[PDB]
Amino acid sequence: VKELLEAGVHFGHERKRWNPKFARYIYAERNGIHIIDLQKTMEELERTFRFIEDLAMRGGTILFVGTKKQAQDIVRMEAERAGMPYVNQRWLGGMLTNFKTISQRVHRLEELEALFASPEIEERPKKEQVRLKHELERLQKYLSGFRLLKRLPDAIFVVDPTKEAIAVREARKLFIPVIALADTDSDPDLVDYIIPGNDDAIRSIQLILSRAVDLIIQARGG
RNA sequence: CCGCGAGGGGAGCCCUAGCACAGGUGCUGCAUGGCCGUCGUCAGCUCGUGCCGUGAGGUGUUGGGUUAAGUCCCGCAACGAGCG
């Protein structure tokens, strides 16, 4: 799919906290706010979506990550709706530089899941019980999505890049493509495929991902 | 053990003379083992990988909350692990 001129959504976001480099991406100031040139955003999209389509049909993986409070619930949704891995709760230092060391935690989840189904439950101390029950809890928070990662992702779809600059930093050093729903406050110089756009607005993130995930699907053929 | 005997060599055991050596609570705990006192039953000491730093190093083990406790919670470039 391709989507309209639904301007009733990401006209602009940040005050004057911007990033000079972002200049190319803005229309003007109105009431002390930078307003993003959409005619342009469209030119970006037409590229960014071109990319993902390539990925989808090529059968790759894209990790969705956005730790912002607003996008929180929407990240979960969209990745879920897609055949994708996501990072909802919090981003852990190294889900890429230190993947192998992290993947070991996954296994922990894998291995605890088991015991909370086997006979060897209550049969053994109760102090440990809770001491384990807790471990699951926490794991099934952070790694809830991270679980689907068999190996390193072919791309990272980031929501607020300047907030996740870590996750970007990582990707940037492993040569993994970076997509982002960036705005005024970001430094485009590091997003492989940007999408100039308001983001704190649930209506923004909600649209950008929808059409993005929709695209992903129609690309695979379902 | 030997040819019947007489007696002859031999094992163990004994003394004598010489020898190898036995013995020494004789020095050195700054030459040592072991075992113990002690800070201290105090809550701490550290490692792998990741990341920071030219480096020595750092982060993690920190902060805010909590505990008898590095006991647990929230948070955080870290995620774990070991001795405790």
- Gaps after which residues in chain A, C–N over 2.5 Å? none
User: Is A11 inside a domain boundary?
Assistant: no
What size, in residues, is chain A? 222
Query: What is the C-alpha to C-alpha distance for residues A95 and A143, in angstroms, rounded to an integer?
Result: 10
Query: What is the C-alpha to C-alpha distance for residues A210 and A40, in angstroms, rounded to an integer?
Result: 20
Query: What is the C-alpha to C-alpha distance for residues A154 and A62, in angstroms, rounded to an integer?
Result: 6
Could you tell me if A96 and A86 lie in one domain? no
Distances (CA, A) of A187 to A13, A18, A34, A99, A183: 15, 9, 15, 26, 9
Q: Is A24 helix (H, G, I), strand (E, B) or coil?
A: helix
**Which among A103, A216, A106, A97 has a CA at the least distance from the CA of A168?**
A97
Could you tell me if A38 and A120 lie in one domain? no
User: Is A9 inside a domain boundary?
Assistant: no
Residue A73 CB neighbours (<10 A): 13
Could you tell me if A86 and A105 lie in one domain? no
Q: Which nt is closest to the CA of A143, judged by C1'? A: B79
- Which CATH number does the domain housing residue A55 bear? 3.40.50.10490
Strand pairing category for A178-180 and A193-194: parallel
- Amino acid A135 reads E
- Amino acid A169 reads R
Could you tell me if A113 and A87 lie in one domain? no
- Boundary-marking domain end, from A143, A167, A183: A143
User: Is A7 inside a domain boundary?
Assistant: no
- Boundary-marking domain end, from A143, A173, A207: A143
Q: Which residues are A12's β-sheet partners? A: A35
| Cα dihedral: A168, A170, A171, A173 (round 10) | 120
User: Is A6 inside a domain boundary?
Assistant: no
Number of domains in chain A: 2
Distances (CA, A) of A210 to A6, A74, A82, A109: 13, 9, 10, 30
Q: How far is the CA of A221 from the C1' of B75 (A)?
A: 43
Query: What is the C-alpha to C-alpha distance for residues A222 and A207, in angstroms, rounded to an integer?
Result: 20
- The answer to whether A221 touches A50, Cβ cutoff 8 Å, is no
Pick out residues whose CB falls under 7 Å from strand B. Answer: A 90-94, 97-98, 100-102, 104-105, 134, 138, 166, 169-170, 173
Q: Is A65 helix (H, G, I), strand (E, B) or coil?
A: strand
Q: How far is the CA of A32 from the C1' of B22 (A)?
A: 107
Q: How far is the CA of A97 from the C1' of B45 (A)?
A: 28
Could you tell me if A202 and A120 lie in one domain? no
- The answer to whether A219 touches A57, Cβ cutoff 8 Å, is yes
User: Is A5 inside a domain boundary?
Assistant: no
User: Is A38 inside a domain boundary?
Assistant: yes
Could you tell me if A43 and A85 lie in one domain? yes
Could you tell me if A87 and A182 lie in one domain? yes
Query: What is the C-alpha to C-alpha distance for residues A21 and A137, in angstroms, rounded to an integer?
Result: 42
Which residue reads 């979506």 in tokens?
A: A49
Could you tell me if A160 and A187 lie in one domain? yes
| Cα dihedral: A27, A29, A31, A34 (round 10) | 70
Residue A162 has which token pair?
């300047």
Could you tell me if A86 and A97 lie in one domain? no
Q: How far is the CA of A147 from the C1' of B45 (A)?
A: 35
Could you tell me if A98 and A58 lie in one domain? no
Nucleotides of B under 7 A from a protein CB: 48-51, 72-80
Structural domain containing residue A100: 92-143
Helix or strand (DSSP H, E) at A74: helix A72-81
Tabulate helix, strand, coil % of chain A (nearest 5). 50, 10, 40
- Method of structure determination: X-ray
User: Is A205 inside a domain boundary?
Assistant: yes
Strand pairing category for A193-194 and A62-65: unpaired
- The answer to whether A183 touches A27, Cβ cutoff 8 Å, is no
Q: Which residues are A156's β-sheet partners? A: A63, A178
Could you tell me if A201 and A96 lie in one domain? no
- Which CATH number does the domain housing residue A113 bear? 1.10.287.610
Sorted by sequence, the CB contacts under 8 Å of residue A84 that are 6+ apart come out as: A61, A62, A63, A64, A78, A145, A148, A213, A216
Query: What is the C-alpha to C-alpha distance for residues A203 and A43, in angstroms, rounded to an integer?
Result: 21
Could you tell me if A166 and A86 lie in one domain? yes
- The answer to whether A24 touches A184, Cβ cutoff 8 Å, is no
Which residue reads 């071109």 in tokens?
A: A50
